[PDB]
Paper text:
After unsuccessful attempts to obtain a crystal structure of PlyP100-FL, analysis of an AlphaFold model suggested the endolysin is actually composed of three separate domains (D1, D2 and D3) separated from one another by long flexible loop regions.
The structure contains a single zinc ion, which is coordinated by residues His28, His137, Asp151, and His177, the latter of which results from the C-terminus of a PlyP100-D1 crystal contact. The identification of this zinc was not verified experimentally; however, its assignment is supported by analysis of the site using the Check My Metal (CMM) webserver, and is further supported by its tetrahedral coordination, favorable hydrogen bond distances, and coordination through histidine and aspartate residues, which are consistent with what is observed for catalytic zinc binding sites in proteins. Thus, the interaction with His177 and the aforementioned zinc ion is not present in the native enzyme and is merely an artifact of crystallization. A structural similarity search was performed using the DALI webserver, which indicated that the PlyP100-D1 domain is most structurally similar to amidases from Gram-positive bacteria. Following Cα-atom superposition, the PG was shown to be positioned in a mostly negatively charged Y-shaped crevice in PlyP100-D1, with the zinc ion situated at the branching point of the glycan and peptide chains of the PG substrate. The mutations E89A and H137A, which we propose to be important for catalytic activity, eliminated the function of PlyP100-FL against the cocktail of L. monocytogenes strains, and H149A severely impaired its function.
Author numbering: 2 to 181
The structure:
Amino acid sequence: VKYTVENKIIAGLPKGKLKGANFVIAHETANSKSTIDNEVSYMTRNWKNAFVTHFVGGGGRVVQVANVNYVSWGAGQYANSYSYAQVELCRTSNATTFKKDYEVYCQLLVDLAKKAGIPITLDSGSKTSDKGIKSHKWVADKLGGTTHQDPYAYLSSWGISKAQFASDLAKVSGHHHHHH
Ligand SMILES: [Zn+2]
């Protein structure tokens, strides 16, 4: 799947070194009324409270709001010290929009993991040494420093289980000539 990264990197962010480039975090906004543009404007003004690296939404748009391979304030202190990137899915009520949003979400999570040298697994293991794509839920369950459970409630409303999300991420990495 093809996408365009819109550069809206927030001016003035800290560029904190990671303890390791071990995770890519899978989020969603939990906001049934916001657009991706609303989310980007809000996070620009409120970055001191929280920020991620990327939004996905608005029909498979990507907006980058922070550089990767530095701390982002997205998932509590324990995940934030080990997250190469943090990718946040915006909501839609439109099935055509969602299919675009979701395909691009899966492609971007795999693209970032591959660039960081992180395995394409979902919610594997239990520690900061278990590299991979991690839901906010897995961070809450295994590391603490947060209680959020995204993105599974939202994916479930669109008929996508955790098992289906794992299999969809593997299908991106499993493409013929995805890698050497
Ligand atoms: Zn989250």
